[PDB]
Structure 1
Amino acid sequence: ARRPARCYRYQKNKPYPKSRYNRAVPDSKIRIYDLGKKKATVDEFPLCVHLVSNELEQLSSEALEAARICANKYMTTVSGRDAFHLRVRVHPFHVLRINKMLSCAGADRLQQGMRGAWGKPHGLAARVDIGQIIFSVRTKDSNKDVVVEGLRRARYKFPGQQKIILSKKWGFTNLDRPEYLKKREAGEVKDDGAFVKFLSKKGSLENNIREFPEYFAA
């Protein structure tokens, strides 16, 4: 009962989010976005691999769900359920419309054609760009060959072209590997639930000393 994704592949319309002018959309099919060992610390998983688009198109929420399930299932079967952290870095906010025509014989007796042809919501999609990350996984250096294969299996569920790039960053942060290493040898990083908070030279010295004590322990 669902149209093929080629009818909604391209970004032909303006963004159409769920708002107080829509008020009746179907809920998204993808619901879980972070999975694997999502409660892991930052220095547990140094390596990060990205599935990144090469197209300017719309990805369906159904396709996002299918790719998430495929990559998660493959990596938990080959490497264990808590050896990786996968994060879906796109969210379906664009709403797809359909002008539903009757498929009955002699429909033109009651069709009215293209008059008042404004559509009804039937699906949700995420609008991506050139070089935008869809999937991001962080793991140890011993799981590179299985997370590349997991992303390669997940790439079949997506239209268009995607690339698998091994990032130069440490995990889900934005510093490089030696930059993060020379930062964490000092005490100016401090862990959070999954992420890490950093020290800055601004701010009040009392707060900067109750937090982050080992760097000032010089």
Structure 2
Amino acid sequence: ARPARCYRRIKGPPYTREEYIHGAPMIQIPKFDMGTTSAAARAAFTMVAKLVAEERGQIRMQALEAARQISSKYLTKYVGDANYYLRLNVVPHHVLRENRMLAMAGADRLQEGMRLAFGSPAGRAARVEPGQVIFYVEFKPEHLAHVKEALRRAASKLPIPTRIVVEPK
């Protein structure tokens, strides 16, 4: 895959209508809510931590997934699934394109260079704004250090600067 800097910047309109996009990729993220998802048991949790974007840009689906695994694995190992709720708040609706000569992908992909330069689908990304909430964690106040560490580890995998915001529910 290309470096994420190639697709970090928002440079055009959103590309999301899958009934018009040919060969649109599937969303590979297997689940979006972690931990104790039922609201009856979330009533125990009183602290809210939020990993929040600082700049405007695009996060790739693989980057979101890697942050999700690192944060969820840390939270399971050190807080236990019965003591937290973790939600990846954004969905990668945007479809990324790449212009490259390749295999059987249309007769217009066999012409080299910038001739017929509209690329084929290459992945998915979530277009985010400043102050947008990327990760949302509900937790009991005793696990604040572990939750902040999990959010830091998740933030290490993302292409844009972020911050952690802690507050009461």
Match of 1:139?
139
After TM superposition, the structure 1 stretch with the greater mean CA deviation from structure 2, 3-12 or 93-102, is: 93-102
Hey, what's the Cα distance between the residues in 2 that align with 1:114 and 1:58?
24
Q: Report 1 or 2 for greater relative contact order, CA contacts < 8 Å, sequence distance ≥ 6.
A: 2
Hey, what's the Cα distance between the residues in 2 that align with 1:112 and 1:55?
35
Q: Secondary structure at the match of 2:142?
A: helix
Match of 2:6?
7
RMSD: 1.4
Deviations 1:111-158 (A, max 9, x none): 432111111001000000110000000011111111111001111000
Paired residue total: 161
Give 1:4 deviation, angstroms.
1.1
Deviations 1:14-35 (A, max 9, x none): 0000322114211112131111
Match of 1:212?
none
Give 1:39 deviation, angstroms.
1.9
**Once superposed, which parts of structure 1, at least 4 consecutive aligned residues long, lie more than 3 Å away?**
none
Unmatched runs of 5 consecutive residues or more in structure 2:
103-109
Contact kept? 2:18, 2:24, Cα under 8 Å: no
TM-score, normalising length: structure 1: 0.70
TM-score, normalising length: structure 2: 0.90
Give 1:76 deviation, angstroms.
0.8
Match of 2:97?
97
Deviations 1:34-83 (A, max 9, x none): 11111242421111000000010000110110000000001111121221
Hey, what's the Cα distance between the residues in 1 that align with 2:101 and 2:112?
10
Match of 1:36?
35
Which amino acid in 2 is paired with 1:83? N
Contact kept? 1:18, 1:95, Cα under 8 Å: no
Could you say which structure has the higher strand fraction?
2
Percentage identity across paired residues of the two chains: 43
Hey, what's the Cα distance between the residues in 2 that align with 1:57 and 1:78?
32
Hey, what's the Cα distance between the residues in 2 that align with 1:53 and 1:113?
36
Give 1:3 deviation, angstroms.
1.1
Hey, what's the Cα distance between the residues in 2 that align with 1:30 and 1:18?
19
Match of 2:59?
59
Contact kept? 1:61, 1:126, Cα under 8 Å: yes
Hey, what's the Cα distance between the residues in 2 that align with 1:158 and 1:139?
22
Which amino acid in 2 is paired with 1:45? F
Give 1:101 deviation, angstroms.
3.1
